[PDB]
Amino acid sequence: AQNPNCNIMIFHPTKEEFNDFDKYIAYMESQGAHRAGLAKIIPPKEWKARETYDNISEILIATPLQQVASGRAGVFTQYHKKKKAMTVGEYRHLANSKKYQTPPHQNFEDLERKYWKNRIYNSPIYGADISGSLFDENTKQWNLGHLGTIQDLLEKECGVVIEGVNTPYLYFGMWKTTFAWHTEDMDLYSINYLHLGEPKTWYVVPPEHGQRLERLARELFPGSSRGCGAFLRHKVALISPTVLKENGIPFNRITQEAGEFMVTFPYGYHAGFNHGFNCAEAINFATPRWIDYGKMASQCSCGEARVTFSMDAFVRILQPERYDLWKRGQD
Ligand SMILES: O=C(O)CNC(=O)C(=O)O
Ligand SMILES: [Mg+2]
Ligand code: NI
Ligand SMILES: [Zn+2]
């Protein structure tokens, strides 16, 4: 069995190996990358996403979200408070202000200590889930706006044509902006490209151990757990590496820098934070190996998780027994 300790693998494809996306994901899996739940892909030196980032300041962040925490330093939830619209240029200035800027630090490890110690006492502002792309239309390799769609993958594997579309999302982050413990909708893959700015630290639980994380989460968030049998779908719970180690949950950590891709694998629980002002782009995708994970994915039916139009057909076709109850939660 390849990668039996489920370590995060890092790949350095040549320009020739960067041509065929599907083939390269399948190569990574042949080496055991999926066992970690997360992999890093460093693009060939010849490659670029676009010529410059000099003209992005007029992008609108229509609903910036202030991430307010409750709980204790290592075990907390966050809720998103909606703020007034601002441009990327306005947001970058805010990120760099004395109230919100990255503190002085020695190295990534010192910054990670400061995050875990102090996150709860601040409420950073995140520009999340903004439909759009920063890839140049002429970038032919690993362009997240030109991937094969999940609807076409289900059609190719299963023979059923379905409605729905699949487009990327932009994330503008600042110091301490946080992504809570989750897997993707329908336990899909994701791919994330860090276009510019400061790093993003990730934590991940191997897919084979995901239920261990879920059991801990039910213990640590006992009211949430009673309200919904899949409450990590709400994307609001944080658990620190210290707490995970104290409870024996297997995980790994890695920092992504500007110009690097990360791939999350089906049922790979992940969480993390941004080091300072940055812009990432991400999208879900599928392969043939995903289908069995989609069929088994948990669902939130309490009404909190509320998701895209395109998840309907996935539930309808892969999980027909669940469909009725899940749609009640959507309406
Ligand atoms: O970058 C973020 O805030 C969160 N991204 C992801 O969870 C992802 O790409 O799967
Ligand atoms: Mg602009
Ligand atoms: Ni994710
Ligand atoms: Zn729920």
The set of residues, in sequence order, having a beta carbon less than 8 Å from that of 33 and lying 6+ positions away, is 3, 9, 11, 39, 263, 265
Query: Which ligand is in closest contact with the Cα of 226?
Result: 4
- The answer to whether the CB of 271 is under 6 A from ligand 1 is no
Residue 110 parent element (H or E): helix 108-118
Domains in the chain with CATH codes: 1-331 (2.60.120.650)
Query: Using CA atoms, how far apart are residues 4 and 144, in angstroms rounded to an integer?
Result: 30
Q: Shortest CA distance to 234 belongs to which of 309, 300, 323?
A: 300
Query: Using CA atoms, how far apart are residues 206 and 58, in angstroms rounded to an integer?
Result: 39
Task: Say if residues 67 and 77 touch (Cβ distance below 8 Å).
Answer: no
DSSP label of 35 = G
| Approach to solving | X-ray
- The answer to whether the CB of 282 is under 6 A from ligand 1 is yes
Q: Say how many Å lie between the first and final Cα of the chain, rounded.
A: 44
Q: Distance, CA 89 to ligand 2 centroid (Å)?
A: 8
